[PDB]
């Protein structure tokens, strides 16, 4: 099924920013499913998230079973709402909204999903431990296997 | 399917770190499915979660379809693997680890998936926002229903 992402970026850091400014729109809007859409608009629509982000970041809304990972960038922007575990995210908040909205040139009752991403992971974000991050626990030793490498059978 | 989840709670604000911390103990395991429990132990187990955390908090660890949501407060833990929409979480995410541990008294090879949070979203917070607390969005009106009351069939 459709997702609607509705990308609030005031400061216009991003791709998405940037094609809403340039177009006087506050959002764009990012539509996943099997139509795809990329277009700044005035307004989010029912059951969309809007995505008000400070700038370019990996942002996951985790929205239960619904999972949509974004990488926002200055000069693209890549999405899915498909398991996406090569990269880090930064997992925003889902607060949903009672809302009246603009669809279809009609005032209408909505819900929307208000997610804040505070812009703490960057874009492209390998999701392992390097051999000097790896963080030191108790009880956790060393291995000498790789994580792919790991997995087994 | 069990969940297991080791917390790290190295200043011991919240319930978990206090108990591991008087019994001597790095972790707090909570064990979450068919069989509950609450116990400090030395070592995190295989597929584990270690959830590093800094102090009380709301915390949703999110592994893919598998989430995890917790309450960490000085006096108490509570924990789900279903989905908990009431209330507001710390989204953290996992990092995959390849490491060595005991398990049943023997070292093995093992994948943890390493947690951390911040401590940033304080246990028990509505997942709504007052009138006061609305973000203001453009083309985003204000509606005279509820959340719960605008969901009406």
Redesign the interface.
């Known amino acids: 099924f459709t997702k609607n992402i509705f990308v ?1 970026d005031v400061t216009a850091k991003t791709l998405c920013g940037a094609i809403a400014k340039l177009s006087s729109q ?2 764009c809007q990012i539509k996943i499913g099997r139509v795809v859409a990329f277009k700044p608009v ?3 629509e029912p059951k969309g998230y ?1 995505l ?1 982000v400070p700038g370019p970041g990996a942002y ?1 809304i ?1 929205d ?2 619904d ?1 949509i990972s974004l990488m926002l960038t200055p000069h693209g922007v890549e999405a899915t709402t498909e ?1 996406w ?1 090569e990269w ?15 669809y279809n040139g009609v ?1 209408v ?1 909505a ?2 999903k ?1 997610c ?1 991403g505070m812009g703490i992971v960057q874009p492209y974000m390998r ?3 390097d051999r000097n991050e ?2 030191d ?11 792919r ?3 087994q059978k």
Chains 1, 2 share one sequence.
């Open positions: 609030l506050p959002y005035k307004n989010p809007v008000n996951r985790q239960g079973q999972i398991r575990e880090k995210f930064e997992g925003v908040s889902v607060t949903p909204m009672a809302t009246r909205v603009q005032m009752d819900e929307i208000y804040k999701n392992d431990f790896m963080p626990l108790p009880g956790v030793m060393r291995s000498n296997y790789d994580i490498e790991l997995r």
